[PDB]
Amino acid sequence: GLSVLVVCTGNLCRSPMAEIILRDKIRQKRLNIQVRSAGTLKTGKTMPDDKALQALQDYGYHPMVNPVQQVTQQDFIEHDFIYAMDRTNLADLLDICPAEHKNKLALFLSKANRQEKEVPDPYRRSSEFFQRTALLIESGAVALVDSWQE
Amino acid sequence: GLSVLVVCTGNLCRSPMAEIILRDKIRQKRLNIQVRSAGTLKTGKTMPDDKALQALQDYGYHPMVNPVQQVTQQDFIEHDFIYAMDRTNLADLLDICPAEHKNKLALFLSKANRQEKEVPDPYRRSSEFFQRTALLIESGAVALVDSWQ
């Protein structure tokens, strides 16, 4: 059958989510297409992010998940199409994709008739908000320390 | 000396961040104040969240960290002040604080002269964003399935 690979930076959130969702919709439509996911960067992790998996459960998907893996050279040959979650992902694959297979590269959102062209990284968004929390807590802490000396 | 407790739901993010930041500011002025943190809800976890700690490092704090712990009744007697990061925390504390000690309870931001009176939960925001991330991915997936068939 057909072979599809989905790729984000760490294979921790976005691309594993797409794999699980694609697999399900493929099985609903009884298509003979298999799907995997991979990251551009070697992470130390074994399994995808728990918060990715819980969001899939909230929407009725069963997250039975493959181990995290980084993209390889054989992936560009063995797979029929390969989808990138954001432009940075698409660039790094093109950076290392031999010219014979570069037409197989595309952004994940390319067939959805929507304004959004990249799916943004939830992890960077997460970090931004934790950094924002720190600043608010810092402001609170300074006031408490003042009040205490009074 | 003075003893201060700061409290969130899981003792994973807001309250340990506050403990570490408070400890730094107390030691900067060599005040005789101790600070600890605790959660209203018993989770199984041992240490706070990695991204709470990294966010502290990003701002130059050195996160030396106590194990996660749940608030106890001894906490309401042993501590001089007890701060809830948000109203949900303050409500859960009022539920189990003996009436003799409820005057020790206050919102963490009660002395910051700001609009914000609650520190919003980064975990709930994060969860919201993963859900909207999934929906964007799902709509993408549906389109991909169509073009193939």
Residue numbers in the entry:
A (entry chain B): 5 to 154
B (entry chain A): 5 to 153
List sentences from the manuscript:
Here, we show that a tyrosine phosphoregulatory system controls the biosynthesis and abundance of Vibrio exopolysaccharide (VPS), an essential biofilm component of the pathogen Vibrio cholerae. The phosphorylation state of the tyrosine autokinase VpsO, mediated by the tyrosine phosphatase VpsU, directly modulates VPS production and also affects the kinase’s own degradation, to regulate VPS production. We found that VpsO and VpsU have respective kinase and phosphatase functions, and we have determined crystal structures of VpsU and the VpsO catalytic domain. We found that the VpsU tyrosine phosphatase controls VPS production through regulation of the VpsO phosphorylation state. Together, our data suggest that the phosphorylation state of the C-terminal tail of VpsO, modulated by autokinase and VpsU phosphatase activity, regulates the functional state of VpsO to control VPS production and biofilm formation in V. cholerae.
VpsU is a 166-amino-acid cytoplasmic protein containing the hallmark C(X)5R motif of the low-molecular-weight phosphotyrosine phosphatase (LMW-PTP) superfamily. We next determined the crystal structure of VpsU at 2.2-Å resolution. The two molecules in the asymmetric unit form a domain-swapped dimer. The overall fold of each monomer is similar to that of other prokaryotic and eukaryotic LMW-PTPs. It contains a central four-stranded parallel β-sheet flanked by two α-helices on one side and three α-helices on the other side. VpsU contains the same complement of active site residues as other prokaryotic LMW-PTPs including the nucleophilic cysteine (C12) and the tyrosine (Y127) that stacks with the substrate phosphotyrosine. In the crystal, domain swapping in the dimer occurs through exchange of the C-terminal α-helix (α5). Although size-exclusion chromatography data were consistent with dimerization, we cannot be sure that domain swapping also occurs in solution. In a steady-state kinetic analysis of the wild-type activity, we measured the KM to be 0.9 ± 0.1 mM and the kcat to be 1.4 ± 0.1 min-1. These findings suggest that VpsU has phosphotyrosine phosphatase activity and that cysteine 12 is necessary for catalytic activity. Collectively, these results show that VpsU dephosphorylates VpsO in vitro.
